[PDB]
Amino acid sequence: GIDPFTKTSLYESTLKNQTDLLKVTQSTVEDFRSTNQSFTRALEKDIANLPYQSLITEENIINNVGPILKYYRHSINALNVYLGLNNGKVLLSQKSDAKMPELRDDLDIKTKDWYQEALKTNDIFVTPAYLDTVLKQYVITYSKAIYKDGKIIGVLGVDIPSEDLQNLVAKTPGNTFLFDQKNKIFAATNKELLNPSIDHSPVLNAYKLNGDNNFFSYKLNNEERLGACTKVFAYTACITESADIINK
Numbered sequence: 001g002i003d004p005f006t007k008t009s010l011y012e013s014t015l016k017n018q019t020d021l022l023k024v025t026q027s028t029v030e031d032f033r034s035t036n037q038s039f040t041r042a043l044e045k046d047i048a049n050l051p052y053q054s055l056i057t058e059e060n061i062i063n064n065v066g067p068i069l070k071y072y073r074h075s076i077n078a079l080n081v082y083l084g085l086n087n088g089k090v091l092l093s094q095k096s097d098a099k100m101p102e103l104r105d106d107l108d109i110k111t112k113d114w115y116q117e118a119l120k121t122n123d124i125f126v127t128p129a130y131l132d133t134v135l136k137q138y139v140i141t142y143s144k145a146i147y148k149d150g151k152i153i154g155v156l157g158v159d160i161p162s163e164d165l166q167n168l169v170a171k172t173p174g175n176t177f178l179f180d181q182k183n184k185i186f187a188a189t190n191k192e193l194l195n196p197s198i199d200h201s202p203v204l205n206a207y208k209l210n211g212d213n214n215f216f217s218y219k220l221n222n223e224e225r226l227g228a229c230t231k232v233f234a235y236t237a238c239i240t241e242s243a244d245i246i247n248k
């Protein structure tokens with residue numbers, strides 16, 4: 001509508017709407033992370049509460065920690081749950097034919113960021129998505145150095161398929177999407193946005209000028225669109241819509 005009063009009413013309404021929906025996608029990402037963190041923390045506590053005797057031989061680690069890894073893996077349908085040791089071995093509970101957790105020596109764990117970085121923080125470390133070597137799926141890893149009496153036991157890892165987060169984001173209302181820490185498209189409600197040749201520089205450029213949660217105007221094929229983005233951990237969450245709501 002031409003009258004500026006009416007246009008402003010449309011603009012303020014749609015800003016609120018789109019900001020709400022962006023928030024839902026932000027919350028989705030947050031809740032995914034915090035659920036996985038809480039799970040990892042719980043597992044750390046159960047391992048560290050074992051007596052040392054149960055932790056200080058490899059056979060005892062297999063027999064006493066293995067079942068805990070397995071139950072926890074099942075409870076959340078994780079892809080892998082594991083404990084890496086300073087001798088380079090990793091006690092691995094992996095999806096797929098119910099075979100018992102095994103101590104693997106061939107996974108080059110001291111070269112891995114999930115291992116290395118866990119020893120450099122007292123927090124849980126969360127990797128970018130990457131191709132798991134074991135099961136050959138893209139995963140987000142949550143890792144945690146486990147200490148008992150101050151003494152390192154090993155580095156706990158939990159691999160959750162990145163597709164789980166992609167699927168949760170896709171389900172949300174609104175034309176929302178998520179870029180990874182290299183500004184590559186990661187997840188979207190509209191699956192077309194995942195074409196790697198799509199040009200996201202208008203939205204990313206507008207975000208760069210405007211900042212988190214600040215609604216902007218931009219152009220596509222000479223038509224006006226409206227959007228907003230915000231940082232959510234190392235991701236960028238955005239929403240966009242046509243400006244026809246305000247212009248027409």
Ligand SMILES: CC(C)[C@H](N)C(=O)O
Binds near residue numbers: 090132139
């Ligand atoms: C060790 C394995 C389970 C881990 N996902 C990795 O690829 O390093």
